[PDB]
């Protein structure tokens, strides 16, 4: 790029013109070339940057996804996260996120808390869920039903203030013994 | 959180040199120094395209509130979109659409009433007049609120399923006492005081309209977005009136009032003028980009965490522990409800 | 490599005048000419140039022969059927090998082409061809290079262009080249496999910009675009009385510079050829407003100041320039924005026995302020002493100019006088002439309003300017309103048409078809504009009436609106994405599908939960 | 981990001239190039 001088090449710009007259275009070379260099610099820190930000954010997933499992969620790729398996690539890293995604589920009649004799029992880690007929406890992501026990719930109400009680019999494995 | 800028899509050669054949000539001496520029320029604006469907568009499908409002007793008609309104909107967006004034709006094509404006023509007329246009935002304003309304009916229905894989129904109350079971205190105590919690979440959630209404700025940081980009688009063009050493300041009188061959000088200091300052702004404008782009990204993550989802880590999601947050669009940014 | 080069190119899918033989028309000549001509044996000899083609004018003759050539630049008349009729006083007799290659395998079926270009810029006359065996048929369509052959500097007007014919006992295809942007595909070899000509479609545009023959699906800002003005107003105050330079030059006492007269002239109208033939000019450096565009100028006040000198006194006065006559009688400013004049008189500042009428000054206290006078008669002190008079150490300020007829040029007595325009903006008195147009209060118009050029629109106004207000402004410093200098009504003057184009294209490989997208500028502006070729953008997007989509983004060509709804593809702006699908095929535009529409059926008591599970492995990168 | 830096307040006007009335005014043709500095200066004053 000629800049607004006589010509773009330093070698026949002196070759051509006298030093005390080739000054003033080699000063606008000078000027020109100067501010093109400031400006690829200017605009790789910014990329660089940029890119930083990206890297310690590779960093942190890397720390977290891959040594451990985060509970914090969609951060570790789609879906409950379970590993990360890191590859590298030509100037970054490739993650693979092992997730845990549910599947099929139908419709369960719930409820909040069950009232076996005027005591309201809520479920230690789960859902009561119920078939159509017996109610019975689950856990959160997987459908596995169990007999509701004296271990599976904690009991603590009155049968009153517990919105959504639901009569219906508990066992204890005591009495038969 | 600020989540994008207006997008700007400033012509080098149209700034530097006003439909001027030797103007634009002696800029093309300039080598391809501004075709940075407008790179540059286009890369921002896919950035902050790219921001807003990081921050928002974090759905699968589209969800809907059922027909029926009772969450058990909570009371959210403030937070879910308004059938009545034609914007279907809720009550808080409103109050923030008008609370923040743009500048340039940039959806109005606006050439036309210059002509009509009768009086001094106003910001946008001028820098129409000098090649300084705003582009507008691919996402409206208008479907961005229908993505919050997935977000929020997401969250109120389904609780922190949907952000996983598929949307699993659970009652209000039941998802209340996970919440509360994942801060360490056990669900008895909700289904035992929800009525209590019931009117305490109506009663803050109520005052937080007062809140925004009565304060002069709570919107203090979009506000501040949009002043720092309608201040920076104004220097920019106010340097058009700078003679930068110069017989004068105008393209067109000084090619009608010096020949060519010594025009040229006065030409050439006003293209190295106006493009250090062309410069200047798009300098400035990569690094509020930036700083803008760092801030959607934690708007994301803050999203991605407090809604779709309980998240332990400590004053993250607001103050106290963490139990839920609703989000509502803003003009040029998310506001979060924790 | 993918150079891309300006220069004089034959525009792609142009129009060729195709002709025939069995008288020989002359054909005009400009940028250039394209010559193509497909033959059995020879039946065309050579090519005349130049202008008029007589006895008055140099011409050139490119007449071949089998054997050489006879390319020469010579003041021929006609042959009117020996060819060097009259060569006259001749030029550039050239000789070299022949430019027609001819070859036959046995059979005369290889009927090849022969393409040439000729073009005279900067003279410096350049000749290319290329010959082709035939495959099919005229002016066939695959690619070909051209090659140069002799590059001889004429350097000779050419504008008229003429061809010669054959004897003894389906050609003359013509072209003309156009100043167009090329993007031109190199092989390995250095040979040019493929061209495309970047102001043809708008993928043409779009490839061009990025330099690659592949476009990747997507949406590209390749340009802008402003409607080019059909017709333009210029209109002036409503005066016409002439200004007096005759007086300032028909005068004879002009001021010795130790007082140099200084007249005003205001409310008038200076045209400058009155100035022009009352001196046989002889410096006429204007250091203000070219003599050119004087008279398209219009200035508050202007002052003339009248004061004879020498030729190096006339170099001497000049914006802030030393010299005793410039720093103790006249001055001009450093700044000094006006023209000087200066002719030669040795007919009113001469006689025999000499005349020493006029005066100068050497001796001033200090210097002279620009645009001040210091006429006064103070003998200038040297040492300390108050003395007051003649002789030694007691010399008057001021010498006499004595001029006499017989002197060097350096000598003469020069008459100087200057113009010292201000080119302020105040409201203007001495406009030149320029004639006034009327108004085209809705049509976009170059205007020339009082030395103020400019483009725009003009509409109605009632910005209510106080009687004293005129050029105005916006909030921004952009002229925004000039009251009418005739009528005083005000006129708002508003940006021509600009906003941008962009090309929305699917993958050249999956398609070539393209959408245009004009930003923020309403289609039927455009359709007004395109209907009546004033855009500047010279590929004309087709319509079909079906093809127009008035967005927030502006306004989409090309594709049209099907109201269903997809996940995007192209982005464009404001929820509308463009994509290539099938009817077969063509380019749609619609409104975004933000995902799946899904209901969820909450209820008090109903929870769904999963009676199984998937396991899935995602990558970030 | 830093948490900020020295807080500066360059003054464009005398740093590029020394009390000097000329070169002042032929500064003020630069136009509003340098407030923007001043501006960016205090802005990131604030923000540390
Ligand atoms: O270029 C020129 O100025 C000269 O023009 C004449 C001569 O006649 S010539 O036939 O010999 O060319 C040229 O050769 C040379
Ligand atoms: C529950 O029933 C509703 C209504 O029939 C249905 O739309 C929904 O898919 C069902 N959910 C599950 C998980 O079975
Ligand atoms: C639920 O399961 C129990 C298991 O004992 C069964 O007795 C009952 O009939 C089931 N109810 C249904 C299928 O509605
Ligand atoms: C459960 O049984 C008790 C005892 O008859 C009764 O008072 C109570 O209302 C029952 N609860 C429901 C919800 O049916
Ligand atoms: C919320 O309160 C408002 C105002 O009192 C009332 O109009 C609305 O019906 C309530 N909605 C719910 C879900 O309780
Ligand atoms: C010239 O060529 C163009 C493109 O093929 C065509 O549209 C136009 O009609 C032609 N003009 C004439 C006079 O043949
Ligand atoms: C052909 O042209 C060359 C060059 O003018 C000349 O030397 C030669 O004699 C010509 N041959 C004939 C047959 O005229
Ligand atoms: C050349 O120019 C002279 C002078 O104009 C003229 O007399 C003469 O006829 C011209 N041609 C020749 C052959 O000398
Ligand atoms: C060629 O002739 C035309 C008039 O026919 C004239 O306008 C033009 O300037 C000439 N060019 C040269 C190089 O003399
Ligand atoms: C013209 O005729 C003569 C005599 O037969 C022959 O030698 C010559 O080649 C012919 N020229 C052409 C162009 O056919
Ligand atoms: C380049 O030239 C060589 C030598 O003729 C040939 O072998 C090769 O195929 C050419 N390459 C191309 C791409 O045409
Ligand atoms: C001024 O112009 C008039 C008319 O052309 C002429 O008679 C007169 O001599 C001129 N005077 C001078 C000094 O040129
Ligand atoms: C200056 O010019 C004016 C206008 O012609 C004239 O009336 C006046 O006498 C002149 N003064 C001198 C000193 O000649
Ligand atoms: C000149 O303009 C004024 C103001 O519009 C008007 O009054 C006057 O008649 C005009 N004169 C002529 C002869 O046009
Ligand atoms: C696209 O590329 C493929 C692979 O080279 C080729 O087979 C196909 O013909 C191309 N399509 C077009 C229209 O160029
Ligand atoms: C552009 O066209 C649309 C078509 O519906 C129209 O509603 C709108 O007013 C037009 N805008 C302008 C600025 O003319
Ligand atoms: C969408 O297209 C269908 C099919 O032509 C038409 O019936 C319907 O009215 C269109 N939409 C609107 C809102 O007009
Ligand atoms: C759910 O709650 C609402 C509000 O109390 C009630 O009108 C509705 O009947 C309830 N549905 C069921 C199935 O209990
Ligand atoms: C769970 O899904 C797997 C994989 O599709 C299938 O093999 C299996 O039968 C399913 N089990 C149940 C209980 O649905």
Same mark, same amino acid.
């Given at each position: 790029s ?7 090449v ?5 070759s ?20 093109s ?7 790789? @820190?910014?990329?660089?940057?940029e ?8 960093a ?5 996804? /891959? @040594? ?26 490739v993650?693979?996120?092992? #997730?845990y995604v549910?599947?099929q ?39 596995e ?6 271990? $599976?719930?904690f ?10 009680i ?12 | ?27 093309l001496?300039y ?18 395209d !790219?921001?807003?469907?990081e ?13 029926? !409002? *009772? ?22 967006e ?9 500048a ?6 606006? *050439? ?10 106003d ?7 000098n ?23 997401? #969250? ?10 598929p ?5 209000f ?9 994942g ?11 929800? !009525? ?29 977005v ?6 920076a ?7 058009l ?15 009608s ?5 010594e025009?040229?000088v006065?030409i050439?200091?006003?293209?190295? +003028? ?62 979060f409800?924790? | 490599?993918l ?21 020989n ?5 400009n ?31 490119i007449?071949?022969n089998?054997?050489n ?10 042959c ?5 009729s009259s060569?006259?006083? %001749? ?7 022949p430019?027609?290659?001819? @070859? ?22 350049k ?9 099919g ?6 690619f ?29 295809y013509?072209g003309?080249?156009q ?16 061209a495309?000509? %970047? ?8 490839? %061009? ?8 699906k997507?949406?590209y ?25 005759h ?22 109208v ?13 410096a ?11 008279n398209?100028?219009?200035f ?7 004061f ?11 914006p ?11 001055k001009?400013?450093?700044d000094?924005?006006?023209?000087v ?5 040795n ?11 006029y005066?100068y000054?050497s ?23 108050? %003395?007051? +008079? ?8 001021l ?22 325009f201000?080119? @302020? ?8 002439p320029?004639k ?16 103020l050029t ?9 910005? !209510? ?8 402004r ?28 962009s090309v929305?294209?699917?993958?050249? $490989? ?31 997007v087709?319509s ?14 090309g594709?049209?609106?099907?109201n ?46 999963? #009676?199984?599970?998937?396991?899935? /492995?995602?990558?970030?990168?």
């Open positions: 000629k800049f607004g001088a006589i010509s773009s330093l070698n026949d710009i002196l051509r013109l006298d030093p005390p007259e080739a000054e003033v275009q080699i000063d606008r070379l000078i000027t020109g070339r100067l501010q260099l400031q400006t690829y610099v200017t605009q790789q @820190l910014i990329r660089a940057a890119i930083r930000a990206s890297a310690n954010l590779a942190t997933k890397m720390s977290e996804c /891959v @040594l451990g499992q985060s509970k914090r969620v969609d951060f570790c790729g789609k879906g409950y996260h379970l590993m990360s398996f890191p590859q590298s690539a030509p100037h970054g890293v993650f693979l996120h092992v #997730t549910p599947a589920e139908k419709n369960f009649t719930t409820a909040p808390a069950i009232c076996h004799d005027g005591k309201a029992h809520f479920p230690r880690e789960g859902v009561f869920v119920s078939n159509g007929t017996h109610w019975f406890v689950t856990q959160r992501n997987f459908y039903p169990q007999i509701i026990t004296t271990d $599976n719930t009991v603590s109400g009155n049968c009153d203030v517990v919105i959504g639901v009569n219906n019999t508990v066992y204890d494995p005591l009495q038969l013994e | 959180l600020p989540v994008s800028m207006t997008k700007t899509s400033v012509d080098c050669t149209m700034y530097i040199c006003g439909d001027s054949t030797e103007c634009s000539n002696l800029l001496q080598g391809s120094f501004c075709t940075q520029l407008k790179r540059a320029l286009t890369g921002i604006a896919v950035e902050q !790219k921001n807003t469907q921050v928002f568009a974090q759905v699968k499908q589209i969800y809907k509130t059922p027909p029926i !409002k *009772y969450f058990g007793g909570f009371n959210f008609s403030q937070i879910l979109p308004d059938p009545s309104k034609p914007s279907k909107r809720s009550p808080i409103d109050l923030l659409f008008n609370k923040v004034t743009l340039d709006a940039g959806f109005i094509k606006q *050439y036309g009433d210059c002509l009509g404006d009768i009086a001094a023509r910001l946008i007329c001028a820098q129409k007049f090649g300084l246009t705003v582009l507008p935002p691919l996402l409206t304003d208008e479907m961005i609120a229908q993505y919050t309304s997935a977000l929020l009916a997401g #969250t109120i229905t389904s609780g922190w399923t949907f952000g996983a894989g949307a699993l129904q659970i009652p109350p039941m998802q209340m006492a996970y919440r509360f079971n801060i360490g205190v056990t669900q008895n105590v909700l289904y035992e005081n929800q !009525k209590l919690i019931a009117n305490q979440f109506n009663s803050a959630i109520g005052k937080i309209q007062d809140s925004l209404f009565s304060t002069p700025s709570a919107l203090g940081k979009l506000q501040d949009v002043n720092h980009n309608a201040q688009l104004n220097t920019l063009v106010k340097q009136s700078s003679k930068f050493g110069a017989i004068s300041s105008v393209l067109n009188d000084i090619l009032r010096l020949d060519p061959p025009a040229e006065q050439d200091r006003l293209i190295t +003028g106006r493009l250090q300052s062309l410069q200047t702004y798009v300098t400035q404008q990569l690094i509020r980009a930036a700083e803008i782009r760092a801030s959607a990204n934690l708007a994301a993550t803050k999203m991605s965490e407090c809604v779709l989802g309980q998240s332990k880590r400590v004053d993250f999601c607001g103050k106290g522990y963490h139990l839920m947050s609703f989000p509502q669009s803003a003009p040029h940014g998310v506001v409800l924790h | 490599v150079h891309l080069t300006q220069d004089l190119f034959l525009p792609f899918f142009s129009n060729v005048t195709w002709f025939h033989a069995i008288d028309p002359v054909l005009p000549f940028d250039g000419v394209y010559f193509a001509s497909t033959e059995k044996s020879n039946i065309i000899r050579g090519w005349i140039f130049g202008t008029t083609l007589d006895s008055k004018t140099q011409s050139l003759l007449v071949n089998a054997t050539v006879f390319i020469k630049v010579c003041e021929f008349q006609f009117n059927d020996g060819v060097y060569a006259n006083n %001749c030029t550039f007799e050239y000789v070299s090998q430019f027609l290659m001819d @070859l036959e395998g046995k059979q005369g079926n290889f009927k090849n082409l022969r393409e040439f270009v000729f073009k005279n810029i900067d003279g410096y006359f000749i290319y061809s290329k010959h082709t065996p035939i495959i048929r005229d002016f066939p369509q695959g070909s290079a051209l090659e140069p052959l002799v590059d001889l500097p004429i350097g000779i007007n050419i504008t008229r262009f003429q061809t010669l014919l054959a004897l003894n006992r389906a050609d003359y013509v003309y080249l100043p167009r942007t090329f993007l031109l595909k190199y092989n390995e070899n250095g040979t040019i496999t493929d495309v000509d %970047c102001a043809l479609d708008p993928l043409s545009e779009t490839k %061009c910009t990025l330099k690659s023959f592949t476009v990747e997507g949406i800002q390749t340009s802008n675009f402003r409607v080019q003005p059909t017709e333009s107003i210029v209109r002036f105050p409503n005066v016409t009385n002439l200004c007096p330079f007086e300032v030059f028909n005068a004879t006492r002009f001021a010795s510079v130790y007082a140099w007269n200084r007249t005003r002239i205001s409310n008038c200076a045209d400058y050829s009155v100035l022009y033939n009352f001196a046989p000019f002889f006429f450096k204007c250091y203000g407003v070219s003599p050119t565009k004087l398209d100028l219009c508050t006040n202007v002052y003339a100041d009248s004879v000198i020498k030729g190096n006194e006339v170099s001497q006065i000049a802030g320039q030393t010299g005793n006559i410039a720093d103790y009688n006249y001009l400013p450093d000094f924005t006006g023209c004049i200066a002719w030669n008189s007919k009113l500042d001469s006689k025999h026995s000499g005349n020493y009428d005066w000054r001796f001033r206290k200090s210097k002279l302020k620009p645009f001040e006078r210091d006429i006064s008669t103070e003998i200038y002190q040297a040492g300390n002493k108050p %003395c007051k +008079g003649k002789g030694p150490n007691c010399y008057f300020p010498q006499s100019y004595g001029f006499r007829p017989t002197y060097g040029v350096g000598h003469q007595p020069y008459r100087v006088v200057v113009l010292s201000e080119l @302020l903006h105040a409201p203007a008195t001495v406009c030149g320029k006034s147009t009327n108004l085209v209060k809705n049509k976009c118009v170059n205007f020339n309003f009082n030395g400019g483009t725009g629109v003009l509409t109605k106004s009632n910005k !209510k300017f106080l009687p004293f207000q005129q050029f105005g916006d909030i921004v410093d952009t002229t925004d309103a000039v009251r009418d200098p005739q009528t005083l009504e005000i006129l708002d003057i508003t940006p021509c048409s600009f906003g941008g184009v929305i294209t699917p993958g050249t $490989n999956t398609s070539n078809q393209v959408a245009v997208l004009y930003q923020g500028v309403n289609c039927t502006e455009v359709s007004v504009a395109i209907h009546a070729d004033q855009l500047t953008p010279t590929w004309r087709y079909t009436g079906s093809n127009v989509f008035q967005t927030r983004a502006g306004c989409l060509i594709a049209e609106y099907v269903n709804s997809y996940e995007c593809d192209i982005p464009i702006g404001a929820g509308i994405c463009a994509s290539y699908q099938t009817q077969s095929q063509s380019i749609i535009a619609y409104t975004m599908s933000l995902g799946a529409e899904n209901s969820v059926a909450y209820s008090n008591n109903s929870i769904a939960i999963p #009676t199984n599970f998937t396991i899935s /492995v995602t990558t970030e990168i």
